[PDB]
């Protein structure tokens, strides 16, 4: 009766049935969420192109300058000041404007490219003393030539 009676009695308990149904619904929802995450990951892997550039690499500044030139009207941006006090008290200053951290959208060729400048606010880079930053380019398609052309243009502009 600890097992035989309880198993059969709970079969006629509306509260127990409702609880079991709710638990099943929650489990199905969790499985659906996991499947949605897996599907998004697969879609990103098989139908998107990405280029991740860390701040350590020198292409970071070149790409940012190319972005700030190509997209003249960027509502969100940051500022980089070049200050140099030469001997004899000669001060040289110049404001270079750079895309701000966050999400930006540009139009290159006939593709909409999503630019992500993220600044991980967790550690500090030991070789620079600045937080770890990176820039990521995301686009729809399976051709990597767009990023190659963008990098080549940025390098040519920098040089």
Q: Which residues contact a second copy (rule: CB under 8 A)?
A: 6, 9-10, 13-23, 25-27, 29, 41, 45-46, 48-54, 56-59, 73-81, 83, 91, 93, 95, 100-103, 120-132, 142, 144, 151, 155, 159
For residue 134, give both structure tokens.
């990176």
CB of 46 to a second copy, least distance (A): 8
Angstrom CA distances, 16 to 56, 84, 105, 142, stand at 59, 76, 52, 52
CB of 70 to a second copy, least distance (A): 16
CB of 124 to a second copy, least distance (A): 5
User: Where is 17: in which H helix or E strand?
Assistant: helix 14-47
Closest C-alpha to 136, from 107, 103, 111, 112: 103
CB of 119 to a second copy, least distance (A): 9
Q: Which is nearer to a second copy, 74 or 108 (CB)?
A: 74
Is-contact 79 94, C-beta < 8 A? no
């Amino acid at each position: 009766m600890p097992f035989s009676d309880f198993v059969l009695a709970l079969k006629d308990n509306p509260y127990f049935g409702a609880g079991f149904g709710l638990v099943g619904v929650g489990t199905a929802l969790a499985m659906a969420r996991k499947g949605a995450q897996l599907g998004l990951v697969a879609f990103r892997r098989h139908y998107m192109i990405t280029l991740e550039v860390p701040a350590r690499d020198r292409s970071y500044a070149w790409l940012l300058s190319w972005l700030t030139r190509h997209s003249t009207r960027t509502q969100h941006l940051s500022v980089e000041t070049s200050y140099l006090q030469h001997e004899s008290g000669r001060i040289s200053t110049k404001f270079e404007f750079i895309p701000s951290p966050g999400n930006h959208f540009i139009w290159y060729q006939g593709k909409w490219i999503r630019v992500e400048r993220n600044r991980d606010m967790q550690m500090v880079d030991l070789q620079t003393g600045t937080p770890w930053e990176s820039v990521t380019f995301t686009a729809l398609g399976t051709d990597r030539k767009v990023f190659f052309n963008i990098l080549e243009e940025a390098r040519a502009l920098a040089l």
